[PDB]
Amino acid sequence: STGSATTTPIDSLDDAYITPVQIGTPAQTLNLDFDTGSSDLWVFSSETTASEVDGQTIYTPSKSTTAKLLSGATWSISYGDGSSSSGDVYTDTVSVGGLTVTGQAVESAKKVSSSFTEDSTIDGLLGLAFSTLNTVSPTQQKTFFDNAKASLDSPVFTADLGYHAPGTYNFGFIDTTAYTGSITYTAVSTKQGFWEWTSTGYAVGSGTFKSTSIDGIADTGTTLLYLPATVVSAYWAQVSGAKSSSSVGGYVFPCSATLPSFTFGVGSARIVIPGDYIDFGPISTGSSSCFGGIQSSAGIGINIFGDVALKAAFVVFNGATTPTLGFASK
Template identity: 50%
Template sequence: MHFQQIVASLALTSLAVAAPLSEEKRASPSEKFTVFQDKQARPEGRKVAGPIALAEALGKYGRVGLSPSPAVKQAAAKAAAQDDGTVAANPEQFDQAYLSPVTIGGETLQLDFDTGSSDLKISYGDGSSASGDVYTDSVDIGGTTVNAQAVELAKTVSAAFASNEGDGLLGLAFSKINTVTPDQQKTFFDNAIPSLSEPLFAVDLKKGQAGTYDFGFIDDSKHTGEITYTPVDDSQGFWGFTTSGYKVGDGETVTEDINSIADTGTSLALLQDDVVSAYYAAVDGAENSQSEGGYIFPCDATLPDLTFQIEDYAAVVPGSFFNYAPASAEGQCFGGLQSSGDLGLSIFGDVFLKAQYVVFSNSPLQLGFAPKDL
């Protein structure tokens, strides 16, 4: 995501400009507003359910009048309802966004999964936006399918919006901040929860390579330690949580509550000024550049790690992750850690999230963090 779009998720409630929901009306391919297509990443099929196979076998070979036990029947019914799925998250240049294949009405689009918004369209808080009509259609993400999902089809887009890669956003925040009017709609995740093995999705973003989103299950092969859970504050419609301190490099831990949100739709880590200043004070040649709009540093500078305390888990972000992209000044690079300014909370975007294995759980309402191979 471009730097001017980093506050996107914080102003979506002011951008509700969609038409009323139409019944099962499918958009034609010609109405799409971009042409970017990547057919390389394809959804994987769902797993074979053991309880279903067991129930079928017992039913087939049982004597007349006999049937599987209630426990087997219950397990089979649960398995039949499971609609778990996994899908690739493919990075754009500089990891500015991750695009995943989503099948809508039989056509595969490339969407940016955004835990900082609740819409299946694109609109930004920096003045760029999209508006249009709302339809219902079948939406499939790697085997997790929701029928009659509200899909927001953009018909009018701003110039800033039109420059984006991909076909749109898929919001994974809470439905309470969905911007459709006059009838607010549920997110894909909320609609999918009844069919999932567990009411959660797990995110494994990676630096410079494809990661995954898993719906309904935790893949323990994707993390190297225990998952630490922390409560979520959803009062603003976001995946809000609190870190209790931070440490720059090998320095002392600073005890400080940092109210934050986990936002896969934001490229950078945006934190309060004292944290940002403390970090760049440890980087030779770093400066807060007015012309660049944020902190820059020599591209060959050695960047320290930054560690955040979440419950009893030390979440480490390698220093190399903060070298985000070349700046316009020769030999200078733009930092992946920047000030959150007057937002009133910190945004842990992809720079932080791709250094962790992250579980977004709806019930209980919590976030899980674990270390992984980087």
């Protein structure tokens, strides 16, 4: 089997991407944020505290003939940005892009934090990191990918995110028309539950490539590129008037600037992030200070190749017995 679904930016900044997902029988279509940095499939639901729902589409298990309470199971998750959600668990049929999993754990939110309530466009998350990070207790549950894996033509999914444009998530096959050149594969450590890999270095603009190992995660659920403070300072030093603002919470630059590209290494290959991908626009409406798309990871504890990086590539998440990541230009 295979599946193929279009993923669409939620706003003009590509803050996140949503992908339609069918849950239950008859199908309830929810727009989920596919997150390679977490392992819970959770949704706004008929159980979500009414004051915490503001325009999201909800899953109603009582309207699904295939829903079953996963008796006694609860879940609670906290994300890198300080957002959170929790609730109980159903099993139901879940389809993405024509690929169907029966008996998927669908984590029904009873509570969500303010950042979820305030984002009417995101109906929940679909985690694609390793199932060892799934928060369901007392019986940990599998991700959609882990449940689908054995049925897939190839044990892979691919992320092809668009810059200010829709993209695609494929399951079970590698679309050889979706990229240019060859795919460069790199080793993955699953020790922390993430798609954790080591970049071979970076360049700023037309500058020389710096060979240096940067360990980080491929995280579709994170908007920006978070790298070590050395790397980030070297990038923003090439932008006149850029500075790190403690009041704003990161590097800002004059909206009048033209940003340089940023290159990261994948083995002996290079992925170039165009400068416009690094522009996240005015810090507040009408401001002439703009927010940078490359930020320091120093206050996180991990480097994160988020959407700013991943949207510059065709990315292969190879879930074979020895997982690997692949990157191609496109």
